[PDB]
Amino acid sequence: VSPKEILNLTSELLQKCSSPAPGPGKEWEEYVQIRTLVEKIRKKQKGLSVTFDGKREDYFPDLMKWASENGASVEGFEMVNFKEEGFGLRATRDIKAEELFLWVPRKLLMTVESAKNSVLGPLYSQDRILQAMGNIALAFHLLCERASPNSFWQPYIQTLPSEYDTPLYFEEDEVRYLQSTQAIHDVFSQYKNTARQYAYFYKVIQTHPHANKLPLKDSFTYEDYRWAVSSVMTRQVQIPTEDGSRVTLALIPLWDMCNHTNGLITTGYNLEDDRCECVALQDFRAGEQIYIFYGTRSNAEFVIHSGFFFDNNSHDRVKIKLGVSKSDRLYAMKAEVLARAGIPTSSVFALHFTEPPISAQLLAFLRVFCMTEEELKEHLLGDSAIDRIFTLGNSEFPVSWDNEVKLWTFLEDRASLLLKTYKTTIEEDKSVLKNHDLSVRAKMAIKLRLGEKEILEKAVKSAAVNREYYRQQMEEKAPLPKY
């Protein structure tokens, strides 16, 4: 393989991935075209530029010794390769809920700030993408230190995974299960973003003099970049800067071996002591895996950015795009009520799987969306208008019984329509999962498309129930709640 052929291929890849979106109906074809080009490049390269002679668990002792010398907690847990979640931490003694059992001083972290002071510093000061996007900066920080045998962070880097289950690693037929879903567009964007960035930085490293000292000047493969961005997207956090005035992105060694379970955030940054601190989410008996709660993300975010699907995610949600139509004769009034309420005229809202399917913001939007002219004037004029605006997001204080019946009818119809745009039904998806033997990645894709439809089906039932509740209040001429 010649370096001129790879440079030609990355130039073609850069041009392909910088073109504008060819319209949603050609996105699958574009995705496959980009995949074909990436795989041609990947097959002509040697995988990860830097690989380590030992097994991943061979390096966990060095991680512990390094973390201990720099003031981190290293007693009371051990690293175990769990089947369901991969490597994680297991308690070696009983740990009580709310016990401060894990702490990591700032010196151990990799941050945008440590990226700036490293060998990447010169190129960082020149490139507009690196300056604007701390996540990409972290990824290149990871790669440069990985390729630096004397790096301070070598004990952390040598214990990182070598592969991930983000969609960047899926086969084409595994992504194909997601055709017609909401999620697949984010899969497309992730793949095109990553390919464009790889080609862009491949050329930048060649052309910039400030990149002459980087080990990436000698070797920078697609596999390198896919590994680095996947390492960052599955593990990065936001912390305050040392001054406490701004926030920065970081990687937190040792702590980021914890796997996810449902609960509440119990990890916080301690600025007085300058360290990350983790208290136990629940009691952990000796021999039990130590879990944390990653955050209130949807399963689409867990799959695309974290590389796993979480069963019983109580924060799961899908998107729903809604806006007041400029052809509506009440557009001006509706837009103004929405503006006074702090809500855009058009937006992407969320439908949740939990007991309230819609947020206060979505409820307020739908109320205005279905308001009559008389109702709109009562939200625009007079000494009670701001009071009425103030309660627009509150389920307890409807505008009118008729307004509620109209809005839940609309939501029922729209969620029903959204269900009819999927290639498969919920029952078909359950049959696929029961009757076929599938890879982990394939199961993630199918569970994701199943989960989108299950949220919409629950919204249909929820809206139908609410429509009947408010139709009852209307027929019984119940007094409206006030104040």
Partner: peptide, 19 residues
């Protein structure tokens, strides 16, 4: 509660052409 809550794998924008 926590002054600086820490979210593992916090979702960031990777679209270098958008914002």
């Amino acid at each position: 509660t926590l002054k600086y809550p820490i979210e593992m794998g916090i979702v960031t924008n990777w679209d270098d052409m958008e914002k």
